[PDB]
Amino acid sequence: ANPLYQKHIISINDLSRDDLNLVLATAAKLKANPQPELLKHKVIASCFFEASTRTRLSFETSMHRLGASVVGFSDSANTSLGKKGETLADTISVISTYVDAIVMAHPQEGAARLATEFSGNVPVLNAGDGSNQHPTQTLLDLFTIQETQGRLDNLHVAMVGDLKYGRTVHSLTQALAKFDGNRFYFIAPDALAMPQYILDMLDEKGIAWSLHSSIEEVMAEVDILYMTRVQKERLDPSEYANVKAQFVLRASDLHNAKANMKVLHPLPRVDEIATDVDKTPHAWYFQQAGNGIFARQALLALVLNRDLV
Amino acid sequence: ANPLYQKHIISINDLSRDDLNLVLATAAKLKANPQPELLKHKVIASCFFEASTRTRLSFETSMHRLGASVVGFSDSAGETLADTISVISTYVDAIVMAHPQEGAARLATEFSGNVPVLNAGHPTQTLLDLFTIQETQGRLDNLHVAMVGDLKYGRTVHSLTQALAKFDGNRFYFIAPDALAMPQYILDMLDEKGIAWSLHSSIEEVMAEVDILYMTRVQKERLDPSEYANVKAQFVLRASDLHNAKANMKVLHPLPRVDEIATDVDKTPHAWYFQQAGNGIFARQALLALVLNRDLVL
Amino acid sequence: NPLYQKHIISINDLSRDDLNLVLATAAKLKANPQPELLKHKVIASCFFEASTRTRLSFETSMHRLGASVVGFSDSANTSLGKKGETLADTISVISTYVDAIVMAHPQEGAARLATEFSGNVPVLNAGDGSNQHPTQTLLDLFTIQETQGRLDNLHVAMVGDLKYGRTVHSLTQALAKFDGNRFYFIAPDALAMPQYILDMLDEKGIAWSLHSSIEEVMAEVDILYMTRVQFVLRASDLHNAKANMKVLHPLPRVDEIATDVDKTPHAWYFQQAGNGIFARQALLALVLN
Numbered sequence: 001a002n003p004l005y006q007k008h009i010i011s012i013n014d015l016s017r018d019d020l021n022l023v024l025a026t027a028a029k030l031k032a033n034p035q036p037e038l039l040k041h042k043v044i045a046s047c048f049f050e051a052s053t054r055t056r057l058s059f060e061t062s063m064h065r066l067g068a069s070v071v072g073f074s075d076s077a078n079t080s081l082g083k084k085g086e087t088l089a090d091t092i093s094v095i096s097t098y099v100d101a102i103v104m105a106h107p108q109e110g111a112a113r114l115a116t117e118f119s120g121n122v123p124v125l126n127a128g129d130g131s132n133q134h135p136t137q138t139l140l141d142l143f144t145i146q147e148t149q150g151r152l153d154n155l156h157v158a159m160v161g162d163l164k165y166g167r168t169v170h171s172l173t174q175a176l177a178k179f180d181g182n183r184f185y186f187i188a189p190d191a192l193a194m195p196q197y198i199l200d201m202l203d204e205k206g207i208a209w210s211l212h213s214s215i216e217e218v219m220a221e222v223d224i225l226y227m228t229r230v231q232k233e234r235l236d237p238s239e240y241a242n243v244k245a246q247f248v249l250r251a252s253d254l255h256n257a258k259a260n261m262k263v264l265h266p267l268p269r270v271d272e273i274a275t276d277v278d279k280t281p282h283a284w285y286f287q288q289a290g291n292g293i294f295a296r297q298a299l300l301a302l303v304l305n306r307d308l309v
Numbered sequence: 310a311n312p313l314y315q316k317h318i319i320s321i322n323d324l325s326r327d328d329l330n331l332v333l334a335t336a337a338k339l340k341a342n343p344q345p346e347l348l349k350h351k352v353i354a355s356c357f358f359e360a361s362t363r364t365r366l367s368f369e370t371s372m373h374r375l376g377a378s379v380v381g382f383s384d385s386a387g388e389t390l391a392d393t394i395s396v397i398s399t400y401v402d403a404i405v406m407a408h409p410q411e412g413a414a415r416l417a418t419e420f421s422g423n424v425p426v427l428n429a430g431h432p433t434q435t436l437l438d439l440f441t442i443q444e445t446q447g448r449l450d451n452l453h454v455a456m457v458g459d460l461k462y463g464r465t466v467h468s469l470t471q472a473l474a475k476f477d478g479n480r481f482y483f484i485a486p487d488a489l490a491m492p493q494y495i496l497d498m499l500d501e502k503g504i505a506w507s508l509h510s511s512i513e514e515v516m517a518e519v520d521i522l523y524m525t526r527v528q529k530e531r532l533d534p535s536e537y538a539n540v541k542a543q544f545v546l547r548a549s550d551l552h553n554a555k556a557n558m559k560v561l562h563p564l565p566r567v568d569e570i571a572t573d574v575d576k577t578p579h580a581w582y583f584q585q586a587g588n589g590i591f592a593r594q595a596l597l598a599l600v601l602n603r604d605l606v607l
Numbered sequence: 608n609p610l611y612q613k614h615i616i617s618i619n620d621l622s623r624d625d626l627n628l629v630l631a632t633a634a635k636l637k638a639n640p641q642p643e644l645l646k647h648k649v650i651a652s653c654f655f656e657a658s659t660r661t662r663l664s665f666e667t668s669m670h671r672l673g674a675s676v677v678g679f680s681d682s683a684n685t686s687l688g689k690k691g692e693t694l695a696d697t698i699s700v701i702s703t704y705v706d707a708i709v710m711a712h713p714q715e716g717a718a719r720l721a722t723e724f725s726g727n728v729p730v731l732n733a734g735d736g737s738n739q740h741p742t743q744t745l746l747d748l749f750t751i752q753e754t755q756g757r758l759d760n761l762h763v764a765m766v767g768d769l770k771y772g773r774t775v776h777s778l779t780q781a782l783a784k785f786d787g788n789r790f791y792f793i794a795p796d797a798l799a800m801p802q803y804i805l806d807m808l809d810e811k812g813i814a815w816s817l818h819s820s821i822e823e824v825m826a827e828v829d830i831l832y833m834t835r836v837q838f839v840l841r842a843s844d845l846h847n848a849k850a851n852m853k854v855l856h857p858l859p860r861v862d863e864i865a866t867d868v869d870k871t872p873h874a875w876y877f878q879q880a881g882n883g884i885f886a887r888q889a890l891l892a893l894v895l896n
């Protein structure tokens with residue numbers, strides 16, 4: 001009855017549409033009736049090998065909102081882990097003898113799937129592995145889309161900025177591609193284009209996507225405008241001309257936006273969303289960030305508790 | 310109702326006298342009678358953009374003594390700060406922050422929404438100073454208070470002087486190098502209120518009269534090295550200086566100390582800087598409890 | 608109990624009876640958890656020296672008993688390097704906040720120095736970054752006791768860097784407080800077990816011998832205790848091992864234990880690390896109740 005019990009959460013690709021809807025339904029229930037003791041007597045490792053203050057504080061808050069305890073580190077440079085040449089595999093194996101679940105973010109794509117080979121029984125939750133996947137960002141993104149659009153089907157969704165290195169949009173496009181009738185607009189520098197493996201997937205599913213050279217040319221029809229930061233720390237040095245944001249959203253761009261349209265951003269932002277956007281009714285990134293608590297609580301509850309909420 | 314509920318606490322002098330009295334009464338109540346589940350189901354951010362280890366550990370201990378959960382960062386190892394605050398304020402019930410840049414905490418209050426911001430670096434230092442005085446002397450009025458060291462640039466003695474001047478009948482003794490004197494605008498306020506103060510070049514000459522001796526550093530940057538070499542010993546406290554001390558007298562120091570309190574002071578009955586530091590727990594518990602809990606602890 | 612409010616700086620300060628009390632308590636807590644035992648305690652996790660595995664193990668143990676934690680995970684991140692911040696004053700202040708202090712520090716004796724300034728507050732030494740500190744030897748002993756059923760009359764082989772792997776020095780001294788144990792030391796000449804350890808065993812009438820390989824003694828060993836050079840064990844070397852034999856390693860390991868050992872029934876270094884939780888729970892419960 002709880003298909004996420006004790007499941008590793010590494011990639012959206014591994015989750016089903018029903019899985020996504022179950023997390024979202026559980027998040028709305030907990031948002032409505034908190035369960036502050038549900039994970040009492042659990043200890044969870046917050047292992048941010050790659051620092052990400054917003055995501056870690058979101059995850060750790062969600063742990064505490066369910067009554068779990070927390071141990072961990074905020075950056076692998078603040079640790080002695082690996083300093084003698086030992087493997088990440090061994091680090092995970094040892095930590096897995098301590099805790100009831102491992103939340104990990106790591107600079108290398110695939111590191112979270114590697115961890116699942118060595119964690120024995122303990123679930124690994126991928127809080128972001130380099131430029132690859134970010135499945136819990138997608139879960140809070142979907143909860144937010146569901147909340148503001150009333151549905152996850154038949155949406156016009158624009159994704160802007162660094163689509164190549166953006167783990168956020170890899171996971172979110174895969175998830176939305178599990179629903180029906182969605183239409184994608186990709187607005188990105190040529191060098192930071194959405195990768196081919198995402199495009200082939202949409203093709204094989206018969207899902208329409210197209211490339212666009214401006215936000216304005218798609219503004220009138222988008223329901224969700226998903227903005228991203230250039231992943232400066234992941235760019236190849238030959239991609240240095242792409243560090244500066246090529247597409248900037250300003251309040252004036254919203255003059256012909258649909259009444260229901262919301263602008264999302266996984267955050268942090270550089271200048272791709274000007275601060276005059278913050279005051280409009282379309283700005284929804286901080287609401288989105290707040291919904292991460294409910295999405296991440298839901299996931300933690302479903303993974304760590306045998307039965308449903 | 311509780312007048313500090315959901316209030317930002319950025320500066321000590323934003324506190325009315327009634328609110329100061331409320332904090333101090335609440336600290337005393339919690340110290341005598343702990344309330345270990347008061348902040349159960351609260352999550353508090355401990356946001357130390359620049360490390361301030363002793364202050365962070367004190368604040369976080371205070372959170373746990375009240376049953377609250379804690380998330381944060383202990384060190385970073387304007388536009389982003391605004392967004393950082395906006396994001397964290399969607400997670401937590403209160404933000405405790407230390408930040409080295411001018412105006413950072415007040416700017417945080419513009420972007421935290423309904424989430425109160427508590428400045429850790431600062432208001433809780435003057436609060437724990439006052440709490441420690443009130444607890445060791447039984448009152449905050451009609452005291453003899455000596456302050457020693459860099460009285461010109463020390464913000465902590467300025468705040469303590471200003472706060473103690475809101476109580477009646479205190480007599481002040483300022484003991485400082487001539488170049489680091491208590492500034493005129495403080496003196497002017499004491500003058501106009503009829504509060505007696507005097508200057509003294511030695512700790513010993515007022516030791517017989519003082520209830521609180523509040524010690525601070527005289528840093529080498531402040532004086533010429535020829536002057537520093539001749540003057541510093543006048544502002545160093547040694548155990549032998551305490552010969553004529555009243556039995557109630559307490560030696561305070563906001564910490565860290567360098568050499569201005571010799572270690573032989575540490576085991577006299579008058580040394581009280583470590584107990585004062587421990588009182589930060591109760592001062593910080595009080596502020597957290599009043600800001601975060603709608604109802605007063607009865 | 609005799610450990611109440613006591614500093615735990617060095618395992619050699621513990622008698623045989625003290626070791627038994629910790630191990631018995633560890634076993635009791637493993638059998639029947641006590642999740643609220645240290646409810647309303649706040650414990651300081653002061654890792655001046657990072658030692659992250661030991662830190663995570665210690666903090667998990669605190670949480671499994673219901674205590675709260677404050678601390679820092681490396682000196683470099685703190686303000687304890689600024690002028691006037693001394694270790695003595697830092698401990699003096701922290702001991703007004705917390706109910707106990709767990710501390711690792713890069714300099715030898717740092718934890719013992721801290722007991723001079725912590726007042727009534729117990730200090731628990733977590734080492735200098737290495738695996739020599741009391742709870743490591745306690746979890747080693749707990750793991751030997753649990754798997755072998757005893758701490759007496761064992762055949763213990765210690766392999767690797769026996770000169771600088773000080774945890775083998777502690778473990779040998781601890782096991783020499785028990786009865787009838789026999790030691791096999793397998794190490795290069797430059798990294799051989801220190802003479803002061805051999806003399807100690809001699810004084811106790813405890814048998815030991817040096818061996819050039821582990822195949823020489825494998826059929827008789829009960830515990831194979833491996834160390835990292837501050838002699839590579841492979842799955843095929845275990846063919847003639849006794850059914851009770853267990854391979855231990857304080858960790859981290861590099862190449863001295865090939866990963867094909869991990870799947871064999873004798874690999875026990877990750878179970879051993881897991882036992883850190885119960886040894887550390889036990890120490891904290893006894894020191895604070």
Ligand SMILES: [Ca+2]
Nearest residue numbers: 248249250253
């Ligand atoms: Ca525009």
Ligand SMILES: [Cl-]
Nearest residue numbers: 010011132133
């Ligand atoms: Cl993947």
